[PDB]
Write a protein that binds this ligand. Structure first.
Ligand SMILES: O=c1ccn([C@@H]2O[C@H](COP(=O)(O)OP(=O)(O)OP(=O)(O)O)[C@@H](O)[C@H]2O)c(=O)[nH]1
Lengths: 239, 48, 315, 74, 21
């Protein structure tokens, strides 16, 4: 008939019941879109870095610049480990990501002495390069914070160029299932009624929704559920 | 037909998401608080 | 105080409060508002446009000499927005008989294009003979140099779609950049009819070629008629073409994609009658178009649905 | 091969200036007229009066939102 | 729900160019 999942309860098992429409900060109803199929750093979890992103440069631009170089466009290789880099992107130069913060604070001379090539002026085009396009992005943020006017990241960079599959960092799309209780750092007291209410941090987070969302192929999606259908634990009207 | 060298080619952090389509750290506005960053079709006027 | 809230315009105890403007202050406008001027929206109605021609316009350019000379023959063929009911056999007989007498290429071909269009509206199958008898020799065969007049091509294509005909693929191919370069001059309705036909016949590969060209030529994607996109997509069973169609589906707009789903669910649904030939079952493509729609729409929060089974853990 | 050694001229001249206001310069705020409050009356359960300054009051506000409040010569 | 579609094959884009040259 009814039970803790179906009934109205302010609290279930000593913690705020996430099932109540009125236990959430109304801001959580505001409309949003799915990120996950977009480039890693455009996603919403990285929002603190969003002001910093870099204008892109596509594969076409890259081949064009291979055959037809510009004098004051610099292509800068950000690949960090020498163990993983076996080829040379034409007309590129090597500033590994790990050094960037230091490198960009050298004088023209000192920079010349440490990296063996001229430090790009702040007007010049700077194209950044990495395996996946992740380290190149982070490096980009560095170059942008010293204020460099044209900084382009080429995502998919060395992997697309050379057909290698390598990665700058090992990060995986899957989030580890949330462990503890709901964090008191996300609990949001209301200012008018002084009423405690959930936010979408923690075990409730949009990442988890997108992660477990229906697959985009009917066959793989039907494989995921029992014969009779997708949600049979629920009463018909909650399905 | 449009070359790789054309300004038409869209290089912005994001294709879809408007807040990721700026040039600088915040969204600059033109005179009269009109949108600068990505102009809408009718804001660009080619007149004499 | 109550279950019925105060409405802030009519209540002086709101209007004249300290958080609003009292009636004894000077009542002028506070700040100006320019909304429509700063960022303006383009007009798109919820309803389709009521006067639009809704067909494939065949562009009748005739010299006003043969236009008068040929009038008793042409009066039987379609003029603008008028579709005389003359049986197609008769019209083709008239062309076969009288056309060798006319000396103009341009005239003979405008006339032919009218014949084709007329036979497209009645769905008479014996009209391709006309293509093989007159046009094929100087247009489609053995790398002939000559470049057919646009209206003729549009007409023949329109005929191959209206009467579902394998022939279209040969003509269409000649229209790409290296050939006649006619493809960027096609109407949105042209694309609509093409897609629908190809879909019925069931060529995934025809569908792919056509969607690629449409996209490159900058057709109006959102205004391609939904029914025909659905019937085309429905035709796709092959793994690679399937991949293509996901990636491609991202080219439509939010709204378009929502109604791709609605239209799809209707054509296999309640509105299964609406089609002359019933759809064929693609459960995969149906599911996918629905899924895509769901991905691209704004997301809503239904917490009792998401967290239904949530239990907290002390780990 | 190299025939020459040279000194690198560049023209760095800024002669044009384009500064565009960021959006938040034009955002709204709430501004208010401000007079010296001569008195206040609150009533919800029980009425309470505070009188800061006794003068003939030239203006009077009434505000109903939570508690009834009347700001005198406000 | 990711990945939506099969990623591009491993193809090497630089080689054909520098080979022509
Ligand atoms: O979007 C729409 C709506 C309605 N219809 C109407 O559906 C009726 C039968 O639906 P069909 O779509 O099966 O017919 P058809 O291909 O022979 O029709 P054409 O589009 O080629 O004319 C058609 O005769 C037309 O009147 C559409 O064709 N498209």
């Amino acid at each position: 008939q009814a039970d803790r999942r179906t009934r109205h309860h302010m609290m279930v098992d000593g913690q705020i019941n996430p099932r109540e429409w009125f236990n959430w900060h109304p801001k959580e109803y505001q409309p949003w879109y799915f990120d996950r199929h977009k480039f890693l750093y455009e996603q919403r979890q990285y929002a603190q870095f969003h002001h910093l992103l870099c204008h892109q440069v596509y594969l076409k631009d890259m081949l064009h610049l291979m055959r037809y170089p510009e004098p004051y466009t610099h292509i800068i290789d950000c690949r960090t480990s020498t163990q993983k880099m076996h080829r040379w992107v034409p007309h590129s130069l090597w500033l590994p990501r790990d050094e960037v913060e230091y490198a960009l604070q050298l004088s023209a001379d000192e920079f010349l002495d440490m990296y063996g090539f001229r430090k790009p002026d702040k007007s010049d085009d700077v194209i950044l390069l990495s395996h996946n396009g992740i380290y190149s992005e982070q490096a980009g943020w560095e170059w942008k914070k010293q204020f460099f006017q044209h900084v382009y990241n080429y995502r998919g960079g060395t992997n697309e160029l050379f057909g290698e599959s390598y990665s700058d960092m090992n990060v995986s799309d899957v989030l580890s299932p949330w462990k503890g209780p709901f964090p008191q750092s996300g609990v949001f007291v209301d200012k008018w009624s002084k009423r405690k209410v959930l936010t979408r941090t923690g075990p409730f987070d949009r990442q988890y929704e997108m992660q477990d969302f229906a697959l985009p192929d009917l066959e793989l999606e039907k494989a995921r559920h029992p014969e009779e259908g997708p949600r049979q634990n629920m009463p018909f009207g909650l399905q | 037909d449009q070359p790789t060298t054309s300004p038409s080619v869209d290089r912005f952090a994001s294709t879809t998401h408007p807040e990721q389509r700026k040039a600088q750290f915040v969204p600059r506005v033109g005179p009269g608080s009109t949108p600068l960053e990505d102009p809408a079709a009718d804001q660009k006027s080619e007149w004499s | 105080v109550g279950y019925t809230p105060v409405n802030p315009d009519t209540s002086p105890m709101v209007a004249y409060s300290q958080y609003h403007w009292h009636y004894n202050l000077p009542q002028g406008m506070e700040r100006p508002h320019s909304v429509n001027r700063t960022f303006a929206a383009p007009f798109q109605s919820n309803h389709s446009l009521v006067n639009k021609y809704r067909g494939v316009w065949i562009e009748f350019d005739m010299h006003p000499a043969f236009s008068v000379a040929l009038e008793p023959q042409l009066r039987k063929l379609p003029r603008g927005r008028t579709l005389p009911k003359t049986p197609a056999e008769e019209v083709i007989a008239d062309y076969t008989a009288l056309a060798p007498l006319v000396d103009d290429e341009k005239t003979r071909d405008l006339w032919l294009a009218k014949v084709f269009q007329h036979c497209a509206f009645q769905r008479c199958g014996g009209a391709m003979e006309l293509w093989e008898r007159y046009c094929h020799q100087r247009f489609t065969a053995e790398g002939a140099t000559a470049k057919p007049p646009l209206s003729l091509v549009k007409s023949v294509l329109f005929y191959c779609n209206k009467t579902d005909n394998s022939g279209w693929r040969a003509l269409f191919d000649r229209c790409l950049k290296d050939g006649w370069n006619y493809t960027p001059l096609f109407d949105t309705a042209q694309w609509s009819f093409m897609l629908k036909s190809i879909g019925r016949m069931g060529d995934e590969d025809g569908v792919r070629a056509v969607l690629e060209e449409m996209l490159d030529v900058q057709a109006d994607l959102d205004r391609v008629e939904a029914r025909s996109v659905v019937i085309a997509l429905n035709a796709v069973t092959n793994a690679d073409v399937y991949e293509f169609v996901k990636k491609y589906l991202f080219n439509f707009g939010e709204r378009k994609v929502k109604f791709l789903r609605t239209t799809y669910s209707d054509l296999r649904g309640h509105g299964a009658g609406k089609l002359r030939i019933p759809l064929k079952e693609n459960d995969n493509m149906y599911y996918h178009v629905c899924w895509h729609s769901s991905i691209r729409s704004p997301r809503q929060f239904s917490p009792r649905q998401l967290y239904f089974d949530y239990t907290p853990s002390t780990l | 091969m190299f025939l020459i050694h040279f000194v690198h001229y560049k023209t760095i001249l800024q002669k044009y200036t384009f500064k565009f206001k960021h959006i938040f310069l034009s955002i709204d705020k709430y501004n208010s007229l401000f007079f010296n409050i001569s008195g206040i009356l609150i009533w919800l359960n029980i009425i309470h009066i505070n009188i800061i300054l006794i003068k003939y009051s030239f203006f009077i506000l009434i505000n109903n939102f939570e508690y009834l409040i009347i700001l005198i010569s406000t | 729900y990711t990945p939506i579609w099969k990623s591009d094959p491993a193809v090497d884009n630089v080689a054909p160019l520098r080979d022509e040259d």
